[PDB]
């Protein structure tokens, strides 16, 4: 890689906030927070709310209710 022409790159850890699952990868962005890491090495830490494990599709279960049908709505409203 040519020198002084590429955006700064630094290794960084990632923790899924919702579940805590951890994965180490490089990125351009830097996080003031830093955490240790196996092999006894510290890296800036980027907390992410949603990851592959967190995302419902990967797990195989979906949170969404999928809404209600109008027949059922009518019965609920009118007690029928």
């Amino acid at each position: 890689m040519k020198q002084d022409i590429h955006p700064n790159y630094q290794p960084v850890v990632f923790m899924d906030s919702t579940t805590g699952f951890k994965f180490l990868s490089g990125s351009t962005k830097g996080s003031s927070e830093t955490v240790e890491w196996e092999d006894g090495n510290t890296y800036p830490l980027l907390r992410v709310e949603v990851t592959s494990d967190s995302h419902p599709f990967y797990t195989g279960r979906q949170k969404f209710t999928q809404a209600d049908g109008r027949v059922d709505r009518f019965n609920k409203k009118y007690g029928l």
């Binding site: 955006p7 994965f23 995302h55």
Partner: protein
């Protein structure tokens, strides 16, 4: 390095088993990843391409090569050599790192993300994903974008068949529909 680790450990033996490879050399591998951002707006204003290039560099960690129109086209007001479109090539560690980031972070942040296409294969074992909008990558900062844009990521592998390609991408993690 996580994705390379995952590949070599789980993915490589699993593909060997499924596809009954005589030697591990036959194992398909992600050969390279080419992220291409076609910017026709540069003709109206080159700074659109400039900012697009900057965003792409932030996303990729490598300065992009500014591809130029090989042919002048009056239909798009395009003169030959006009610097429209950029690309970046990632191999080895950078390739694996970017791919893992795409799987984990950039993909979920897509609006109403229903997964990735399962037919966008050339027919040779090489896939492409069309990202409609940026701001899904953490490095875009959701504000620096003056004009939102998209891109095309081309995953070129050593697989001969879309089937082996599909299994490899799934193993590395690909939200196929």
């Amino acid at each position: 390095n996580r994705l390379k680790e995952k590949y070599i450990k789980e993915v490589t033996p699993s593909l060997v088993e499924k596809f009954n490879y005589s030697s591990v050399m036959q194992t398909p591998k992600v050969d390279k990843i080419v992220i291409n951002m076609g910017v026709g707006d540069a003709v109206s204003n080159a700074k659109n391409l400039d900012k697009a290039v900057e965003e792409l560099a932030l996303i990729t960690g490598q300065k992009p090569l500014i591809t130029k129109a090989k042919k002048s086209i009056a239909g798009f007001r395009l003169r030959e050599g006009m610097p429209i479109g950029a690309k970046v090539t990632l191999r080895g560690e950078r390739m694996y790192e970017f791919l893992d980031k795409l799987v984990t972070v950039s993909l979920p942040r897509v609006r109403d993300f229903h997964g990735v296409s399962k037919k966008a294969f050339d027919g040779r074992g090489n896939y492409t994903l069309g990202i409609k909008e940026q701001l899904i990558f953490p490095e875009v900062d959701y504000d620096l974008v003056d004009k939102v844009r998209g891109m095309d990521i081309v995953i070129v592998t050593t697989a001969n068949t879309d089937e082996e390609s599909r299994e490899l991408l799934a193993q590395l993690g690909m939200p196929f529909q």
